[PDB]
Amino acid sequence: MADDPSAADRNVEIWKIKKLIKSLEAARGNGTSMISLIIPPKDQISRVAKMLADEFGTASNIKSRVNRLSVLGAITSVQQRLKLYNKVPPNGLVVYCGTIVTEEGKEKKVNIDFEPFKPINQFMYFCDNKFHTEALTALLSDLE
C-alpha cells in the first residue's frame, strides 16, 4: 500500500534510518571493528577515501589481526563503494561495514550504503568496537 515506486526510497529512510541507528547502537559481538563514513555536500568523495587510506596503513599495525582485518576489510569494502559515487550528494552518502556475532556463534556481515532524508553535518570518523552515528542519533532525536 505504498505511494510511489521511486518515492519509496524517501519514505524508507524515514523508518529505515530510525531503525538503523537503533540497531547499530544495539549491535554487539566479539572484539571486532565497524565502519561509519559519510560523504556530505560540504566535502569531496576524495576526502573521505583519503582520510581512510591513511587509517588503513596504520590499522595494519594492530597486534590483534581480528581488529586489523575488521578495520582494513571494511575500509576496502567501502572504499570501492565511494569510488562509485564520484559525486557528493546533499543527504550525505552513509556507509556501514562491520561484522558482529551473537552468543549463538553466528556472525553478521554489516553491509549498508544509501542517502538518508536528512543532511550530513560534515566528515565524521568512526570508532573501533562501536558504531559512530551522531547526525543520526541526533537528528532522529531532535525531529522525533
UniProtKB/Swiss-Prot annotation:
Annotated crosslink Glycyl lysine isopeptide (Lys-Gly) (interchain with G-Cter in SUMO2) location: K87
Sites of the modification 4-hydroxylysine? K63
What's noted about post-translational modification?
Hydroxylation at Lys-63 by JMJD4 promotes its translational termination efficiency.
Identify residues that carry N-acetylalanine: A2
Q: Where is this motif: NIKS motif?
A: 61-64
Localization, per the record, is: Cytoplasm
Any transmembrane segments, and where? none
Q: Which family does this protein fall into? A: Belongs to the eukaryotic release factor 1 family.
- Quaternary structure (record): Component of the eRF1-eRF3-GTP ternary complex, composed of ETF1/ERF1 and eRF3 (GSPT1/ERF3A or GSPT2/ERF3B) and GTP. Component of the transient SURF (SMG1-UPF1-eRF1-eRF3) complex. Interacts with JMJD4. The ETF1-GSPT1 complex interacts with JMJD4.
User: What is the stated purpose of this protein?
Assistant: Component of the eRF1-eRF3-GTP ternary complex, a ternary complex that mediates translation termination in response to the termination codons. The eRF1-eRF3-GTP complex binds to a stop codon in the ribosomal A-site. ETF1/ERF1 is responsible for stop codon recognition and inducing hydrolysis of peptidyl-tRNA. Following GTP hydrolysis, eRF3 (GSPT1/ERF3A or GSPT2/ERF3B) dissociates, permitting ETF1/eRF1 to accommodate fully in the A-site and mediate hydrolysis of peptidyl-tRNA.
Name of the protein described by the UniProt record: Eukaryotic peptide chain release factor subunit 1
List the source organism.
Homo sapiens (Human)
The record's gene field reads: ETF1
Covered residues of the complete protein?
Answer: 1 to 142 of 437
